[PDB]
Swiss-Prot record:
This is Thaumatin I. It comes from the Eukaryota. The lineage of its organism: Eukaryota, Viridiplantae, Streptophyta, Embryophyta, Tracheophyta. It comes from Thaumatococcus daniellii. Taste-modifying protein; intensely sweet-tasting. It is 100000 times sweeter than sucrose on a molar basis. Belongs to the thaumatin family.
Length: 207
């Protein structure tokens, strides 16, 4: 499957693609304002994530730091990034279907559109100013808006027991971005697409 990753933001982001224990394609790249990065994702990939990282410094070896979404200091991510990270999430060719969502479960750093480029399903978007409106307790100094699980580490926020409800914090993410997961047991906003669909992830899709 082909993912076109587009930075429409006015600022540079460092895109990242991982399935948690391995890079997808090169695993990460700098995207200046307007730049597009096309990656190939193995069919059958289960639990893939794409995210943006902000305010990175990397040396010539691809070792450094990002203020949001850092994946153990690498340019080319092998593992998931540190919150806060708006997440494009996908499972491909699962019994003939692709499954896509946007999640705020690990917080929000960059607005995002995740849309198929092929026919047969709709895209999802979380493009609200969640950072500007972020409740004081969830504001990350690095930039971005943390999820309550990351900040408070409670059974309720992290849904550790598999029993949890919506919270004042989850309802904030949900009010601004209804088409994104706000907590672990949120009513699924997953979109079902044809197996072997292709997709575009757009950072800052509106502004």
């Amino acid at each position: 499957a082909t993912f076109e990753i587009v930075n429409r933001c006015s600022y540079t982001v460092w895109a990242a693609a991982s399935k948690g224990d391995a890079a997808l394609d090169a695993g990460g790249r700098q995207l200046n304002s307007g730049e597009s990065w096309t990656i190939n994702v193995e069919p059958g990939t289960n639990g893939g994530k794409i995210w943006a990282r902000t305010d990175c410094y990397f040396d010539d070896s691809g070792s450094g730091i990002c203020k949001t979404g850092d994946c153990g200091g690498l340019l080319r991510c092998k593992r998931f990034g540190r919150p806060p990270t708006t997440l494009a999430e996908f499972s491909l060719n699962q019994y003939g279907k692709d499954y896509i969502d946007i999640s705020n479960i690990k917080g929000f750093n960059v607005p995002m559109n995740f849309s198929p480029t092929t026919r047969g399903c709709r895209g999802v978007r979380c493009a609200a100013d969640i950072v500007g409106q972020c409740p004081a307790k969830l504001k990350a100094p690095g930039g971005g808006c943390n999820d309550a699980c990351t900040v408070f580490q409670t059974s309720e926020y992290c849904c550790t027991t598999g029993k949890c409800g919506p919270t004042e914090y989850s309802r904030f993410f949900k009010r601004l971005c209804p088409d994104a997961f706000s907590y672990v047991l949120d009513k699924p906003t997953t979109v079902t697409c044809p197996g072997s669909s292709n997709y575009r992830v757009t950072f800052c899709p509106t502004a």
